């Protein structure tokens, strides 16, 4: 009847790995000393949990460690506008009562959840489907009325909205299907037979050279003489391609008192 | 180093891995929180030995106790009582909150930070679940009518009818005829 | 998915809900906290969540995964990278199936057709 | 012009507006229209600001 | 579909290539109220 150990215990083989994140000499030397006497030291604390004993987290000197919260620009001012920028400092400064309040969830992520419908409302749904697959839809009126009556109205609204969402997602997935299965001009008339016997590695750096000059030793033996000659050839080809240029279009955002179009920004200011 | 993390898994089969690290035999008899009791209780035991220092000057021990209090306040935070709570970062394991996994409201309070909408209201489902009245004991010595009446009351057996919601006591609702004297604030 | 290095912050803020999180650009300041020498090209620092990924690699090469990687400059990079891809995965899904939640979308507050005004 | 084009989010309560479930039972089946995505808001002449 | 019926109206695949030019709209966390003292 031995206590169960987690996988992390087999990585370290001990419950007393004195992990301190503070990289000061005083701290790491004391941890190495404490890490060696943890077997016969009464002032020993575990950092690897087990079935029989809980554990502590990572240590920061005498205090405890937690990562810097992911940058979040949301803040709330009290006395004056601080213009808080989470990217201007490495570690987030503490929140003073008279200066700022930060957003909730220092350590939080964005997820999607769903409420659990009432148990009696679930049983009416199970009985309807069961009577449906057995006796058919046309003979489930009594089971349908029990749903509308026993299920509270807030649940019927959820059920009503679930159908509209999945109807929306159904369309959003089929539009992507249409754009994906569209045959572009560069693949007209091409089938699986016109595909090459190549795999993912054949498009990597070893087989397919990147579009950079110093990716390999291709242009390492080039001299200034060969360059001047190449500059003359590219200019020759430009004697036939520069003949065309797109015409200037009108500025749709000429009026400043008009909602401007979120047009693609220029590469450079 | 990424391969060194999987060393104990290469010598084992999948069934051995599951039986080893996943299917740990349930045993909820251990005093898991002894780790926290020993650590934090050591401050008090350490104060017993530290308050007996042979330091002659009274103001030199003032400095020592000021340093010892600094060590504690890194965990306790607020020195005043009835003001706040201490802060201890603990390890995350499968046995966190193991005896309250059955309760749903405890999960929502710990995990979910809900985003307020324009119609600034608590979710209707959350409000509806909150009205299903909880069970409140009849025993009451705080209301003097019951302090007298309940001395002559006969406790009769409540025969189980097969449910988990038998209202054999009063209900924790302000509008209940046996709880209207209770102040819900 | 974002097919650029830059994105408008307002496009990832909610219009009918309280804004408690933003989708910030990469924190280039964390890159200067690495004490060791490393090579980083400026052409890879703006794309979302990739800077924190390369930093984690640089730290996992200089150090390992045991007793030396556990320093604040390296753990914050690993935590940022793991958190950046989780938030961006949720925002990307929310942008795909809930575009009406965000500012700039014409469906957050639909403008009616002229046939609905009765003129 | 900027404050003329400064609106607040979410408008007014839709529940204080005529329902489509009610118009059906009254004898008029409403027609569902799409969102007008081609209009750009602009400010009027200065005299109306 | 797989022993399940999901009633939906006739889908119009032409809605996929709907030209929707993006428009500018900025949100200002921190702005103006209705009344001031």
């Amino acid at each position: 009847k031995a206590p169960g150990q987690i996988y992390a215990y087999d990585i370290h083989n001990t419950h007393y790995p004195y992990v301190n994140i503070k990289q000061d000499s005083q701290t790491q030397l004391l941890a190495s000393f404490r890490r060696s006497i943890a077997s016969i030291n009464p002032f020993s604390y575990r950092q690897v949990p087990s079935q029989d004993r809980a554990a502590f987290g990572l240590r920061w000197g005498n205090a405890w460690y937690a990562p810097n919260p992911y940058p979040n620009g949301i803040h709330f001012d009290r006395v004056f506008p601080t213009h808080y920028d989470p990217l201007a400092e490495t570690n987030r400064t503490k929140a003073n009562l008279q200066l700022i309040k930060y957003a909730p969830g220092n350590y939080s992520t964005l997820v999607v959840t769903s409420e659990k419908l009432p148990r009696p409302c679930i049983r009416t749904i199970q009985n309807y489907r069961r009577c449906q697959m057995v006796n058919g839809t046309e003979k489930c009126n009594s089971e349908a009325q029990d749903i509308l009556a026993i299920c509270p109205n807030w649940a019927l609204d959820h059920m009503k909205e679930k159908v509209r969402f999945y109807t929306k997602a159904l369309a959003i997935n089929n539009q992507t299907y249409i754009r994906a299965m569209q045959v572009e001009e560069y693949n007209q008339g091409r089938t699986v037979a016109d595909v090459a016997p190549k795999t993912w590695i054949h498009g990597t750096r070893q087989h397919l050279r990147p579009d950079t000059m110093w990716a390999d030793d291709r242009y390492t033996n080039i001299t200034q003489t060969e360059i001047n000659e190449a500059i003359k050839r590219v200019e020759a080809r430009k004697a036939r391609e520069h003949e065309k240029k797109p015409v200037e279009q009108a500025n749709v955002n000429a009026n400043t008192g008009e909602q401007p179009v979120r047009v693609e920004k220029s590469l450079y200011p | 180093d990424f391969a060194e993390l999987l060393r104990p898994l290469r010598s084992l089969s999948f069934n051995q891995v599951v039986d080893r690290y996943v299917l740990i035999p349930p045993n909820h008899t251990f005093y898991r929180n002894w780790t926290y009791e020993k650590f934090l209780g050591g401050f008090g035991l350490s104060y017993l030995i530290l308050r007996e220092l042979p330091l002659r000057n009274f103001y030199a021990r003032v400095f020592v106790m000021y340093a010892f209090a600094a060590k504690v306040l890194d965990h306790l935070g607020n020195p005043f009582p009835f003001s706040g709570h201490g802060q201890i970062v603990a390890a995350a394991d499968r046995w966190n909150h193991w005896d309250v996994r059955c309760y749903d409201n405890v999960m929502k309070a710990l995990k979910y930070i809900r985003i307020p909408t324009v119609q600034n209201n608590i979710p209707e489902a959350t409000r509806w679940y909150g009205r299903q009245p909880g069970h409140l004991l009849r025993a009451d010595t705080y209301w003097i009518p019951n302090l007298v009446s309940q001395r002559f009351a006969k406790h009769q057996p409540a025969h189980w009818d097969g449910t988990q919601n038998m209202p054999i006591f009063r209900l924790a609702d302000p509008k209940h005829k046996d709880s209207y004297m209770v102040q819900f604030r | 998915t974002i097919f650029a290095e830059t994105w408008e912050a307002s496009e990832y803020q909610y219009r009918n809900k309280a804004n408690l999180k933003t989708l910030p650009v990469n924190h280039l300041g964390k890159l200067a906290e690495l004490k060791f020498d490393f090579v980083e090209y400026k052409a890879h620092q703006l794309i979302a969540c990739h800077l924190y990924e390369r930093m984690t690699i640089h730290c996992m090469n200089q150090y390992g995964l045991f007793k030396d990687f556990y320093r604040p400059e390296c753990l914050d990079a690993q935590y940022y990278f793991k958190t950046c891809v989780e938030l961006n995965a949720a925002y990307g899904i929310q942008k795909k199936f809930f575009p009406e939640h965000f500012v700039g979308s014409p469906y957050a507050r639909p403008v009616p057709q002229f046939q609905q005004l009765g003129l | 012009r900027m404050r003329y084009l400064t609106e607040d989010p979410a408008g007014d309560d839709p529940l204080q507006k005529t329902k489509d479930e009610h118009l059906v039972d009254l004898g008029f089946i409403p027609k569902v229209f799409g969102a007008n995505v081609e209009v750009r808001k602009r400010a009027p002449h200065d005299k109306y600001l | 579909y797989e022993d399940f019926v999901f009633t939906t109206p006739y889908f119009q695949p032409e809605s996929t290539f709907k030209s929707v030019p993006k428009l500018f709209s900025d949100i200002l966390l921190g702005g103006v109220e209705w009344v001031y003292t």
């Binding site: 004056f80 401007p260 | - | 009918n16 804004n19 | 609106e7 | 500018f24 709209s25 900025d26 200002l28």
Partner: peptide, 23 residues
């Protein structure tokens, strides 16, 4: 939802000055 929330349709530039917030 934040009380001091406004949606603007035209571009604006805010001053990056200490103790002040304005266009």
């Amino acid at each position: 939802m934040q009380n001091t929330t406004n949606i603007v349709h035209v571009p604006v530039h805010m001053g990056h000055t200490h103790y002040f917030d304005y266009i």
